[PDB]
Design a protein around this motif. Structure first.
Motif, PDB file in Angstrom:
ATOM      1  N   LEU A   1     -15.894  24.100  47.020  1.00 44.80           N
ATOM      2  CA  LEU A   1     -16.370  23.645  48.131  1.00 44.80           C
ATOM      3  C   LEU A   1     -15.539  23.975  49.381  1.00 44.80           C
ATOM      4  O   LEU A   1     -15.994  24.307  50.501  1.00 44.80           O
TER       5      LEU A   1
ATOM      6  N   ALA B   1     -10.585  19.879  50.930  1.00 49.11           N
ATOM      7  CA  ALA B   1     -11.080  20.183  49.833  1.00 49.11           C
ATOM      8  C   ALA B   1      -9.870  21.073  48.990  1.00 49.11           C
ATOM      9  O   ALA B   1      -9.875  20.826  47.667  1.00 49.11           O
TER      10      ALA B   1
ATOM     11  N   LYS C   1     -10.560  21.135  45.219  1.00 53.14           N
ATOM     12  CA  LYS C   1     -12.089  21.467  45.356  1.00 53.14           C
ATOM     13  C   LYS C   1     -12.163  22.948  45.770  1.00 53.14           C
ATOM     14  O   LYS C   1     -12.706  23.104  46.888  1.00 53.14           O
TER      15      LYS C   1
END
Length: 167
Positions: free
Chosen positions: A150, A142, A147
Motif C-alpha cells: 500500500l 502504511a 503495509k
C-alpha cells in the motif's frame, strides 16, 4: 370387579390464580428509544459531542450518500472537514498506534482524503500540493503499519501527482 377402570377426572380445575408467564403477558414497552438513536441527528450531535467514530460515520455518510439520504445535496467539503478532524484529533498518528485492530486505518483515510482534495467536486478546492503531501503521509503511515504494498502504491500515486503537478 367392575370399578376403578377409567377414573373420571374430577376435583380438577384449580390453581388458576398463577397464570403461566409464557401466555398472556404483555411486557412490550411503547418506547422506540433505539429508533431515534439510529437517526442522523444523533450521529451528528455525537459528532459535535466529540465522538470520533461518529464523526467518521457522518463523514462517510456525506461521502457515500447512503445514510445522508439521496434527497439531500451531496457536499464533500463537510465530509472533507470531518475527515480532517478525525485525522487531526487521533492520538494514534504520533507513534501511538498500538491497538491491534486498525478500526481507524490512518493510511486509507489519508489516501481517500488525498484523492478527494486532488479531484474536487464543485464546492471543494483542488489543492495538488496538499494531496501529494497527503499521499506521502499515507504511504509513510502504511510503511509504519508494515503495509509495504500500500505504501509503494500510494507512493507511485504520489509520484504521478507531482508529475502531473508540473504543468
Amino acid at each position: 370387579s367392575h370399578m376403578g377402570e377409567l377414573e373420571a377426572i374430577v376435583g380438577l380445575g384449580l390453581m388458576y390464580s398463577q397464570l403461566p408467564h409464557h401466555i398472556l403477558a404483555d411486557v412490550s414497552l411503547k418506547e422506540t428509544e433505539e429508533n431515534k438513536t439510529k437517526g442522523f441527528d444523533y450521529l451528528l450531535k455525537a459528532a459535535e459531542a466529540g465522538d470520533r467514530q461518529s464523526m467518521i460515520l457522518v463523514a462517510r455518510a456525506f461521502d457515500s450518500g447512503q445514510n445522508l439520504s439521496p434527497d439531500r445535496c451531496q457536499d464533500w467539503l463537510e465530509a472533507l472537514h470531518w475527515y480532517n478532524t478525525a485525522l487531526e484529533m487521533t492520538d494514534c498518528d504520533e507513534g501511538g498506534e498500538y491497538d491491534g485492530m486498525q478500526d481507524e486505518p490512518r493510511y486509507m483515510m489519508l489516501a481517500r482524503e488525498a484523492e478527494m482534495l486532488f479531484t474536487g467536486g464543485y464546492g471543494l478546492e483542488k489543492d495538488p500540493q496538499r494531496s501529494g503531501d497527503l499521499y506521502t503521509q499515507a504511504a509513510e503511515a502504511a510503511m509504519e503499519a508494515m503495509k509495504g504494498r500500500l505504501a509503494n502504491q500510494y507512493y507511485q500515486k504520489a509520484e504521478e501527482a507531482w508529475a502531473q503537478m508540473e504543468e
